[PDB]
Design an enzyme around this catalytic site. Structure first.
Site: not given
Ligand SMILES: CCCCCCCCCCCCCCCCCC(=O)O
Ligand code: NA
Length: 122
Positions: A47-48, A89
Protein backbone atom coordinates in the site's frame (compact mmCIF):
# COMPACT_ATOMS: atom_id res chain seq x y z
CA UNK A 1 -8.91 9.85 2.04
CA UNK A 2 -7.67 8.27 5.23
CA UNK A 3 -11.14 8.29 6.78
CA UNK A 4 -12.32 6.22 3.81
CA UNK A 5 -9.36 3.84 3.89
CA UNK A 6 -10.11 3.32 7.57
CA UNK A 7 -13.75 2.47 6.87
CA UNK A 8 -12.67 -0.01 4.16
CA UNK A 9 -10.34 -1.71 6.59
CA UNK A 10 -13.10 -1.96 9.17
CA UNK A 11 -15.60 -3.31 6.62
CA UNK A 12 -13.16 -5.88 5.22
CA UNK A 13 -11.45 -7.06 8.41
CA UNK A 14 -13.88 -6.31 11.21
CA UNK A 15 -10.96 -4.63 13.00
CA UNK A 16 -10.68 -0.94 13.79
CA UNK A 17 -7.82 0.48 11.67
CA UNK A 18 -6.31 1.98 14.84
CA UNK A 19 -4.54 0.26 16.51
CA UNK A 20 -4.67 -2.99 14.55
CA UNK A 21 -3.32 -1.70 11.22
CA UNK A 22 -1.49 1.41 12.43
CA UNK A 23 1.03 -0.23 14.71
CA UNK A 24 1.68 -3.66 13.21
CA UNK A 25 4.97 -5.09 12.06
CA UNK A 26 7.44 -2.85 10.26
CA UNK A 27 5.22 -1.23 7.61
CA UNK A 28 1.70 -1.00 9.07
CA UNK A 29 2.10 2.52 10.27
CA UNK A 30 3.72 5.67 8.99
CA UNK A 31 6.14 4.60 6.30
CA UNK A 32 8.34 1.81 7.55
CA UNK A 33 11.81 0.34 7.88
CA UNK A 34 13.44 -2.95 7.15
CA UNK A 35 11.53 -5.88 5.73
CA UNK A 36 7.87 -6.84 6.06
CA UNK A 37 7.51 -9.34 8.87
CA UNK A 38 4.53 -11.37 7.55
CA UNK A 39 1.69 -11.26 5.05
CA UNK A 40 -0.27 -8.45 6.71
CA UNK A 41 2.90 -6.37 6.96
CA UNK A 42 3.55 -6.96 3.27
CA UNK A 43 0.04 -5.64 2.49
CA UNK A 44 0.99 -2.43 4.26
CA UNK A 45 4.29 -2.28 2.38
CA UNK A 46 2.52 -2.69 -0.95
CA UNK A 47 0.00 0.00 0.00
CA UNK A 48 2.86 2.39 0.77
CA UNK A 49 4.39 1.66 -2.64
CA UNK A 50 1.00 2.11 -4.30
CA UNK A 51 0.62 5.56 -2.75
CA UNK A 52 4.22 6.28 -3.72
CA UNK A 53 3.37 5.85 -7.40
CA UNK A 54 0.73 8.61 -7.13
CA UNK A 55 3.18 11.50 -7.25
CA UNK A 56 0.69 14.15 -8.35
CA UNK A 57 -2.09 12.99 -6.00
CA UNK A 58 -2.84 13.61 -2.31
CA UNK A 59 -3.94 10.13 -1.16
CA UNK A 60 -4.54 10.94 2.50
CA UNK A 61 -6.83 13.97 1.83
CA UNK A 62 -8.49 13.28 -1.56
CA UNK A 63 -11.97 11.90 -0.94
CA UNK A 64 -13.22 9.42 -3.54
CA UNK A 65 -16.41 7.59 -4.47
CA UNK A 66 -16.84 3.91 -3.83
CA UNK A 67 -19.49 1.38 -2.96
CA UNK A 68 -19.36 -2.16 -1.70
CA UNK A 69 -21.68 -4.62 -3.45
CA UNK A 70 -21.94 -8.42 -3.15
CA UNK A 71 -18.98 -8.25 -0.78
CA UNK A 72 -16.80 -6.53 -3.38
CA UNK A 73 -15.44 -2.99 -3.12
CA UNK A 74 -16.26 -1.03 -6.29
CA UNK A 75 -14.34 2.18 -6.89
CA UNK A 76 -16.75 4.67 -8.40
CA UNK A 77 -16.42 7.45 -10.93
CA UNK A 78 -13.95 10.21 -10.26
CA UNK A 79 -10.78 12.01 -11.17
CA UNK A 80 -7.82 9.77 -12.10
CA UNK A 81 -6.30 10.51 -8.70
CA UNK A 82 -9.52 9.60 -6.87
CA UNK A 83 -9.82 6.37 -8.81
CA UNK A 84 -6.19 5.32 -8.35
CA UNK A 85 -6.21 6.16 -4.63
CA UNK A 86 -9.41 4.15 -4.19
CA UNK A 87 -7.83 1.18 -5.97
CA UNK A 88 -4.75 1.32 -3.73
CA UNK A 89 -6.98 1.40 -0.67
CA UNK A 90 -9.24 -1.41 -1.89
CA UNK A 91 -6.26 -3.63 -2.64
CA UNK A 92 -4.80 -3.19 0.83
CA UNK A 93 -8.12 -3.69 2.60
CA UNK A 94 -8.76 -6.90 0.66
CA UNK A 95 -5.17 -8.00 1.31
CA UNK A 96 -5.72 -7.53 5.06
CA UNK A 97 -8.90 -9.62 4.92
CA UNK A 98 -7.19 -12.38 2.98
CA UNK A 99 -4.38 -12.63 5.55
CA UNK A 100 -6.38 -12.30 8.78
CA UNK A 101 -5.58 -15.95 9.42
CA UNK A 102 -1.93 -15.07 10.02
CA UNK A 103 -2.47 -11.76 11.86
CA UNK A 104 -0.35 -12.01 15.02
CA UNK A 105 -1.21 -9.99 18.11
CA UNK A 106 2.52 -10.31 18.86
CA UNK A 107 3.23 -8.00 15.97
CA UNK A 108 1.12 -5.12 17.25
CA UNK A 109 3.45 -2.43 18.58
CA UNK A 110 6.29 -4.38 17.03
CA UNK A 111 9.55 -2.98 18.47
CA UNK A 112 11.02 -0.65 15.91
CA UNK A 113 14.45 -2.04 16.90
CA UNK A 114 13.71 -5.25 15.03
CA UNK A 115 12.87 -3.48 11.74
CA UNK A 116 16.45 -3.90 10.66
CA UNK A 117 18.42 -3.41 7.46
CA UNK A 118 18.19 -4.20 4.57
CA UNK A 119 14.99 -2.37 3.61
CA UNK A 120 12.65 -4.02 1.15
CA UNK A 121 12.39 -2.10 -2.13
CA UNK A 122 9.17 -1.39 -3.99
C1 LIG B 1 -4.22 10.82 21.24
C2 LIG B 1 -4.25 10.41 19.79
C3 LIG B 1 -4.93 9.08 19.55
C4 LIG B 1 -4.75 8.48 18.17
C5 LIG B 1 -5.56 9.12 17.06
C6 LIG B 1 -6.98 8.60 16.94
C7 LIG B 1 -7.66 8.91 15.62
C8 LIG B 1 -7.25 8.00 14.48
C9 LIG B 1 -8.14 8.05 13.26
C10 LIG B 1 -7.93 6.91 12.30
C11 LIG B 1 -8.52 7.13 10.92
C12 LIG B 1 -8.03 6.15 9.88
C13 LIG B 1 -6.53 5.94 9.91
C14 LIG B 1 -5.97 5.17 8.73
C15 LIG B 1 -4.81 4.28 9.08
C16 LIG B 1 -4.09 3.69 7.88
C17 LIG B 1 -3.21 2.54 8.26
C18 LIG B 1 -2.16 2.16 7.22
O1 LIG B 1 -1.33 3.03 6.88
O2 LIG B 1 -2.17 0.99 6.77
NA1 NA C 1 3.56 2.20 6.25
Amino acid sequence: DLWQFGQMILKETGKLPFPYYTTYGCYCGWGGQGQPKDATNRCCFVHDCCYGKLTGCKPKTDRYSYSRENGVIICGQGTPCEKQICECDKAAAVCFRENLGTYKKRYMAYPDVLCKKPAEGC
